[PDB]
Amino acid sequence: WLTFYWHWKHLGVWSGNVAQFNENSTYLMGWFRDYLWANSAQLINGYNPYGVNNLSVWAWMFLFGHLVWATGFMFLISWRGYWQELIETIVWAHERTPLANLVRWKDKPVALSIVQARLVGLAHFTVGYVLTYAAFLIASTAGKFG
Amino acid sequence: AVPATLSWSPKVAGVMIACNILAIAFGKLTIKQQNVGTPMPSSNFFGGFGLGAVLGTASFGHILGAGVILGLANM
Amino acid sequence: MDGSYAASYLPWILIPMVGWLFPAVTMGLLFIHIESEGEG
Amino acid sequence: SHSVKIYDTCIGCTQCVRACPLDVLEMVPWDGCKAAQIASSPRTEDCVGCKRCETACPTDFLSIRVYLGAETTRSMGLAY
Amino acid sequence: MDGLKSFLSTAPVMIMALLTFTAGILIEFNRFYPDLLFHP
Amino acid sequence: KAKVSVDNNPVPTSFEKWGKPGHFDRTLARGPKTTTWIWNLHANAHDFDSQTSDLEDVSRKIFSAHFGHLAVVFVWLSGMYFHGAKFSNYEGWLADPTHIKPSAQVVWPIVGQGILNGDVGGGFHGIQITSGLFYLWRASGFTDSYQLYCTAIGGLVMAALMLFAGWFHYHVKAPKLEWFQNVESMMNHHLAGLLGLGSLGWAGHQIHVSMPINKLLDAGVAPKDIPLPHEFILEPSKMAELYPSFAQGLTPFFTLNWGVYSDFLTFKGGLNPVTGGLWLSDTAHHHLAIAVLFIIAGHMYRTNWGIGHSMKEILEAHKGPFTGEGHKGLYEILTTSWHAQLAINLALLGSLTIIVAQHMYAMPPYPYQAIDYATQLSLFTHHMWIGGFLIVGAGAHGAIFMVRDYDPAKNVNNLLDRMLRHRDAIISHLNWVCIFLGFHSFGLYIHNDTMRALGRPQDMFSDTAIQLQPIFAQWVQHLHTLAPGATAPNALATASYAFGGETIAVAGKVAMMPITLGTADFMVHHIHAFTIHVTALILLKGVLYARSSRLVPDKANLGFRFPCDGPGRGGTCQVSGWDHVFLGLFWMYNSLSIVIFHFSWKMQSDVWGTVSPDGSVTHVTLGNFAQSAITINGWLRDFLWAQAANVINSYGSALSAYGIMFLAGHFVFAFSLMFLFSGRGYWQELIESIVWAHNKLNVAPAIQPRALSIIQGRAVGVAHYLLGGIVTTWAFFLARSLSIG
Amino acid sequence: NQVVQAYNGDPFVGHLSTPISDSAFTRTFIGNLPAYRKGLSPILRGLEVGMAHGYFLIGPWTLLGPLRDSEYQYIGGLIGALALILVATAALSSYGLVTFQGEQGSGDTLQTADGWSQFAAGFFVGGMGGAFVAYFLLENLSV
Amino acid sequence: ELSGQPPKFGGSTGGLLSKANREEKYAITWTSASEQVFEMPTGGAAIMNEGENLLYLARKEQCLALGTQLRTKFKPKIQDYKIYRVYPSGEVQYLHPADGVFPEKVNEGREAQGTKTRRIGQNPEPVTIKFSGKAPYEV
Ligand code: CLA
Ligand code: CLA
Ligand code: CLA
Ligand code: CLA
Ligand code: CLA
Ligand SMILES: CCCCCCCCCCCCCCCC(=O)OC[C@H](COP(=O)(O)OC[C@@H](O)CO)OC(=O)CCCCCCCCCCCCCCC
Secondary structure (H helix, E strand, O other), X not given: OHHHHHHHHHHHHHHOOHHHHXXXXXXXXXXXXXXXXXXXXXXXXXXXXXXEOOOHHHHHHHHHHHHHHHHHHHHHHOOHHHHXXXXXXXXXXXXXXXXXXXXXXXXOOOXXXXXXXXXXXXXXXXXXXXXXXXXXXHHHHHXXXX | OOOOOOOOOHHHHHHHHHHHHHHHHHHHOOOOOOOOOOXXXXXXXXXXXXXXXXXXXXXXXXXXXHHHHHHHHHO | OOOOOOOOOHHHXXXXXXXXXXXHHHHXXXXXXXXXXXXX | OOEEEEOOOOOOOOHHHXXXXXXXXXXXXXXXXXXXXXXXXXXXXXXXXOOXXXXXOOOOOOOEEEEOOOOOHHHHOOOO | OHHHHHHHOOHHHHHHHHHHHHHXXXXXXXXXXXXXXXXX | OOOOOEEEOOOOOOOHHHXXXXXXXXXXXXXXXXXXXXXXXXOOOOOHHHHOOOHHHHHHHHHHHHHHHHHHHHHHHHHHHHHHHHOOOHHHHHHOOOOOOOEEEXXXXXXXXXXXXXXOOXXXXXXXXXXXXXXXXXXXXXXXXXXXXXXXXXXXXXXXXXXXXXXXXXHHEEEOHHHHOOHHHHHHHHHHHHHHHHHHHHXXXXXXXXXXXXXXXXXXXXXXXXXXXXXXXXXXXXXXXXOHHHHHOOHHHHOOOHHHHHHOOOOOOOOOOOOOOOOHHHHHHHHHHHHHHHHHHOOOEOOOOOOOEOHHHHHHHOOOOOOOOOOOOHHHHHOOOHHHHHHHHHHXXXXXXHHHHHHHHHOOXXXXXXXXXXXXXXXXHHXXXXXXXXXXXXXXXXXXXXXXXXXXXXXXXXXXXXXXXXXXXXXXXXXXXHHHHHHHHHHHHHHHHHHHHOOOHHHOOOOOOOOOOOHHHHHHHHHHHOHHHHHOOOOOOOOOOOOXXXXXXXXXXXXXXXXXXXXXXXXXXXXXXXXXXXXHHHHHXXXXXXXXXXXXXXHHHHOOOOOEOOOHHHOOEOOOHHHHHHHHXXXXXXXXXXXXXXXXXXXXXXXOEEXXXXXXXXXXXXXXXXXXXXXHHHHHHHHHHHHOXXXXXXXXXXXXXXXXXXXXXXXXXXXXXXXXXXXXXXXXXXXXXXXXXHHHOOOOOOOEXXXXXXXXXXXXXXXXXXXXXXXXXXXXXXHHHOOOO | OOOOEEHHHOOOEOOEEOOOOOOHHHHHHHHOOOOOOOOOOHHHHHHHHHHHHHHHHHHHHHHHOOOOOOOOHHHHHHHHHHHHHHHHHHHHHHXXXXXXXXXXXXXXXXXXXXXXXXXXXXXXXXHHHHHHHHHHHHOOOOO | OOOOEOOEOOOOOOOEOHHHHHOOEEEEEEEEOOOXXXXXXXXXXXXXXXXXXXXXXXXXXXXXXXXXHHHHOOOOOOOOOEEEEEOOOOOXXXXXXXXXXXXOOOOOOOOOOOEOOOOHHHOXXXXXXXXXXXXXXXX
């Protein structure tokens, strides 16, 4: 919230169009449309079916963050017992497969613990959050003014 | 080019009557329970059939007759 | 993949080692150490 | 393995013993409650930490607690 | 009947009846006096 | 003289139990002590199996509740007809179907929502409706509002009839269990007396009513001059002049000279050029043939005269070498457990609903349905979501049966036992195929994304690069295009122009055109395969491992719906079948979202559009699907950001109600994350502090407040999540489709 | 014709005798593989395995690699195959180093530290040989 | 040694694994009055022989779940089941019941273990025993 407010206000200040922010920041649809939808036009066009420009890496990292953020949800929502049983099945499959029993694990594979799962999900979530916002901010400001 | 069907003729009646007779003959050798339910007034002329067996084999006869008549009329 | 900076050949050899050689080396060393059943 | 400890508020209701699925708990004569029996944990090396014994205890808070410690094959409930 | 009276007095019926009454009051007042941003 | 066996007045009709909530459950009967008693009350209500152990009583309750749901559906249908009769422009739309938007909801102007009453054409202001009721009514021979009003009144009367039927058949005369178990007679009656008879009646309606009215309507006759439907019956010459074969009466029927009726019982195929829908003669012969087939099929099972196969004999006779006892023992399972029947019926009905959604769009039955893109999109997405939910419910109630009604004594070495005995191989091979599909499908998208981002479009998986052509789908399309020629000689045109052929266009818009498949279609179809196999993996693991597992060997003793087994064994969160259903709901949502997104974008890009008088076709999005849908960035930019303009810029217009709802969808989703990401201990402690606060002022409640249970927390999270996401997609699709002409 | 039963006649073992898991053809074909063949030294086993597992690795880079439409297509495929074989040899050596630090028995000569070392060396040599012979077959002229 | 005929079972993929032949397994023996069918803790149903029956499992929890099923799911109650631990070396260790009397009932001769002489509220604060290798409950 803090960074969205700062960035939109300063975009208006730098472009000289303070009127846009002043009019549209009093309702949430203006935040959705005049800030997110509007300033993503150049970011998502970093690489195009027609070519590639210097914002390509920022678009790729934007998608990368949108992916890692979602990946965190898998640890945050699904919990241990399901994956433990699935790992049981995979262990049986490996132990019963010919030409693969010659190789055996040194450590019995188990599902990640509850606290470890929470930490890993939070880590993926935070990394995706930071990368997505950094990519969007840098791309939008560089395209507008950079 | 609609498939050709036949107006009613004695040949059609004879064909499906033969179908009815063969359906009855086939049913007598295949139906597991033939004398259960409401019976005929005199089963001797029906080969030990009930009402359900007679109705089923007659309906099967009309069905086979319709199929055969339409197939023959097509060609 | 050329650059105009001084000693442009360095990333040609440094990046692979940081990319392949060093990662694999420490990967194997740590894997051996963590499964080392010599002591506890 | 985990540590199962039983305190002096136990009333010998045997609920913890019956709820144990891995047969860790037992009953031993006592003199601090009406039932003259108290729970005991002589086979803690088999406990997994399912907390069913804690779930079954009727006293205020718990006269029985399970502290999860070092994880072994038996404690982790591994069949492979 | 007694049972009907008791059922009508259960929590969901009461809360929804009060909500309907309040909603009707507000909607009627805004029908007759809309756009009331402040006491003039 | 019948198998009927009922009990008279088993349950007296009294109001006392109304005033005692939770009467059914012994746990909730004594009264509430905590707030949980409330949440349990609304949750265990319609679970009749747990309330009583009598199969007969459970079956009677099920029968009555089914009567109740029928009454509710009847009320809904009658309400739809009434609101289309009084508050709709159907009479105005009928005169000018190609210039007036259907509308049946009108908004009171109270706080400015009168702006929602946008102009739908013809001087009428109201909400445009996409449910497609207008096209159904026109295809049903409706011309006057009084007929719709009469239909609504009849629907209300029938709803009252069903309510009284439920009351009588439960509180007064309740059938015995043996009556419920006459599965052979039940199938006979429902296959012949319900499906066959209903289809025959509808065919009679279509032939005697719908054909003359629609023939006049498509010929340019004004709606006010078309004779009332009973005039054709009362004056058969009017029917005969429309169709000459009607002058021959019913003689050709009983003489098997059926070709006489060829003029109004055709095999045309294709679509009606005037309206864009299917030919009504095709549907008439179709429903007549369906009726004949179902009436024939309804006589299969022997009921009371010893003629017909017995289901138990058929089940016990099909057994082979690999299966041992084979299908033996299933008849007793399916005649004593309602949950198995519920699972099978739910799975089949969900698949049937998906089939309905998939088959309607390619060949629109109703007139002008194809020309209304919004109606097509709405109907497809709606019935697809319904089907997905039903399939998930099948996966749930099957596990419920396995936990509760499975008895190992009567299932020795049958098919179910060998399910439970090689389940590990099933789950392992299924897990492998899911992982392989995920890799070799989604990694294709990621590889394309990286190649495009690196300025290497020649290394992509595209039609101008490495190509993944769906050769089998193209071949079957080519085969179905050639079907009218020789494979189905008596067919005038193809079943649907989606396979290929000419471009059927109504007015200035495309009704249906060939749908080519390229690399993008291959990738998306295999993505669908991956998602479906994963959802099947989750639900099948839930069903198979419901009884027990290696981790927990006595899971069935805990029940179907339990949160966990404790932090022991390393952590046993979400091991019940209920948690497997809760996990599969998300994956069903993801799969159906991808399905509807693919349908919408492909239809907009390569099918829909406009036709110029020169004959050229300009699609809605200029055919960007084949080049953009191969990268995730393409989906983000050319589909979501591009097509979300029509919904984000909806403020100040009649479409604003969508935009609001759009934002609403984006909210509840986020809200749901505060239930799925957290646990109940923190909330319990916070409630403890708040209870201290309310206690300080001596205002603490008598009903002790408690945080939601783990199962309830998961349920609330998934429910609000699905609500938010589905509402978002609905608002987006409606605002997009109501703005593309 | 109950062709499906327990594995090795032991119902309590988590496996079943199936037409592909315990059939005579299955056992005959599996037991004759280089890994499971009788009386073979670990070095020869590794050589034989590496032959095939390096021969078949020439394909994917040759037909799909970045140089697939260039004069250097087969060379690129060969280089990729050689690098992958080197990585595989390193993985095998590490597995042998970390797996057999306990007892050194003789029940299986492959399941021993020295046996696995010989197996890995033979695998490396066989992989090089297979990749090179595959390149020689595939490459046109350049000799 | 252990004596008993294995129950009539077709086998399953949920049975033993390499742990039984590498680490340990468990065995359960019981005398059934009459031949009948019981649910395998590993999945499926198995017919158990009349007389003495012997069964191998992978975990003690599975054996005790089977014992509970035997004790609670048959009208002739099976009370004589014994559970042993089987080591790969061949040594058999008898586990359940410990002294021939079920732990649910009090039997003279058992020694109290793990019993504390204080309430749970009288445990010492962590700060008083920090940098030691102990825990508040352990002291
Ligand atoms: C000697 C007598 C006789 C003769 C000459 C014919 C001749 C004919 N019949 Mg026919 N028929 C007969 C007896 C006869 N029938 C009887 C006794 C019956 C009653 C059972 C029928 C019932 C019957 C029907 C119901 C139909 C015909 C049709 C036809 C015509 C086309 C059939 C064909 O090959 O095209 C079709 C060739 C194909 C290769 C199509 C087969 C592919 C189908 C669609 C697959 C269906 C799979 C299905 C779902 C699986 C069943 C599921 C379950 C039961 C296991 C042909 C002129 C058809 C017709 O009217 O043609 C215009 C037609 O629909 N007949
Ligand atoms: C975007 C978020 C996301 C992603 C990527 C996944 C990914 C996965 N989930 Mg999942 N899940 C999620 C969210 C997500 N989930 C959420 C929110 C929930 C809550 C309902 C679940 C619930 C759930 C269940 C219940 C199940 C899964 C399963 C799976 C797996 C399916 C197999 C597969 O996709 O092929 C493999 C994986 C992928 C294709 C993912 C992309 C991997 C990339 C393309 C490869 C990277 C290239 C290379 C390795 C990079 C090298 C660099 C080096 C440093 C590593 C997979 C690991 C199922 C499973 O266990 O597998 C069958 C399963 O049963 N998930
Ligand atoms: C932490 C500081 C830092 C960082 C992030 C980088 C980052 C980079 N350097 Mg670099 N460099 C640094 C300090 C750093 N440099 C210093 C101090 C020197 C002087 C010795 C150099 C000399 C140098 C050369 C000569 C080259 C690079 C190159 C590169 C690029 C290739 C990746 C790489 O480092 O491997 C290759 C580079 C090295 C291995 C240099 C050694 C790294 C320094 C000396 C030690 C840093 C240790 C670090 C603090 C460890 C943190 C631990 C943490 C992970 C827990 C990359 C952009 C290459 C390049 O420009 O490619 C385009 C290249 O050719 N660097
Ligand atoms: C011709 C006979 C016939 C027909 C049409 C039906 C029809 C139906 N049965 Mg059914 N049933 C029958 C015989 C029949 N049954 C017999 C003989 C038995 C005993 C073995 C049962 C036992 C049975 C059970 C146990 C259950 C049903 C249920 C149902 C309903 C399922 C819901 C549905 O299909 O939605 C479609 C809905 C409709 C088409 C609405 C129809 C509304 C009324 C009831 C239809 C009356 C039509 C009637 C023939 C007169 C109209 C003819 C003319 C005047 C136009 C459906 C209405 C389920 C239920 O509870 O529903 C009540 C259920 O659980 N049936
Ligand atoms: C014909 C359909 C059908 C039928 C008859 C049943 C019947 C039953 N189900 Mg089942 N189920 C179905 C479909 C069906 N289900 C589907 C499609 C799913 C997948 C989602 C499930 C998932 C499911 C689970 C997970 C469980 C049941 C249970 C039950 C049993 C009763 C307990 C219950 O749910 O009542 C109580 C009902 C409720 C509390 C529902 C009220 C809350 C809902 C979710 C709100 C819905 C919001 C709505 C869609 C939108 C509103 C928006 C708002 C802003 C206004 C009963 C045997 C339970 C059981 O085990 O009993 C044996 C159980 O745990 N079912
Ligand atoms: C067509 C499009 C491309 C699809 C190609 C994929 C084909 C791959 C597998 C071949 C199908 C074999 C079916 C034979 C199977 C069959 O004939 O069963 C026959 C056999 C039962 O034979 P009996 O004569 O004993 O049967 C008595 C019966 O009356 C039932 O009791 O069933 C089994 O052996 C079950 C084991 C199947 C275990 C393998 C299951 C495979 C699951 C994956 C299926 C993959 C294809 C899915 C796509 C639909």
